[PDB]
Amino acid sequence: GPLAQQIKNTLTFIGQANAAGRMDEVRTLQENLEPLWEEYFQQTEGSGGSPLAQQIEYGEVLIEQARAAGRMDEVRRLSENTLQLMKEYFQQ
């Protein structure tokens, strides 16, 4: 419950930062969202998790691999897609 609420709040803050033209904050919010989702995924979904949860989880892995390679344009594209899936998962 509390962890889901923190993820939902983070999605709201990303929306607000985006609407304010504050993409420097969207970068930070996306980075802090990843470990919250990771914890949520490993505790409530995991290997037996729903296909949507697995798609979001692997999407975050692809984002992190793109970030490690410096492909921040790919981070942004993948982040936009994975955020839409998270909004479906959390009904946000």
Author numbering: 2 to 93
What does the study report here?
The MID1 scaffold, a small helical de novo protein, was previously engineered for zinc-dependent esterase and Diels–Alderase activity, where it exhibited a pronounced structural plasticity over the course its laboratory evolution. For scaffold library generation, we chose a semirational approach, targeting the original zinc-coordinating residues H35, H39, H61 and H65 for replacements by Asp/Glu. Three out of four hits originated from the MID1sc9 template (termed MID1sc9_4xE, MID1sc9_EEED, and MID1sc9_EDED), while one hybrid variant hit (termed MID1sc9_H1_EEED) showed shuffling with the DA0 sequence in 4 positions, namely T11I, T13S, N19K, and E32L. All variants showed a similar trend, preferring the medium-sized Ln3+ ions, mainly Eu3+ and Sm3+, over the larger and smaller ones of the series.
Notably, the tag removal improved the K D value for MID1sc9_4xE by 3-fold (K D = 32 nM). Notably, the obtained K D = 4.66 mM for Ca2+ binding of MID1sc9_4xE reflects a 105-fold selectivity for Ln3+ ions over Ca2+. However, thermal denaturation experiments showed a drastic drop in melting temperature for the metal-free proteins, from 66.3 °C for the MID1sc9 parent scaffold to 37.5 and 32.9 °C for MID1sc9_4xE and MID1sc9_EDED, respectively. Lanthanide binding restabilized both proteins to melting temperatures of 43.9 and 45.3 °C, respectively, in the presence of Tb3+. The asymmetric unit contains a scaffold dimer with polar interactions in the crystallographic dimer interface. However, the dimeric state was not present in solution, as determined by analytical size-exclusion chromatography with static light scattering detection (SEC-SLS) in the presence and absence of TbCl3. Notably, the parent MID1sc9 sequence contributes two more glutamates (E32 and E58) in close proximity to the putative lanthanide binding site, generating a long negatively charged cleft with overall six potentially coordinating carboxylates. Even though the protein was cocrystallized with TbCl3, we could not unambiguously assign electron density for a clearly positioned lanthanide ion. The absence of Tb3+ in the protein structure may also be a consequence of the crystallization conditions, which contained both malonate and citrate. A Tb3+-bound structure predicted by AlphaFold3 also positioned the Tb3+ ion in between the residues E39, E58 and E65, further suggesting that these residues mediate lanthanide binding.
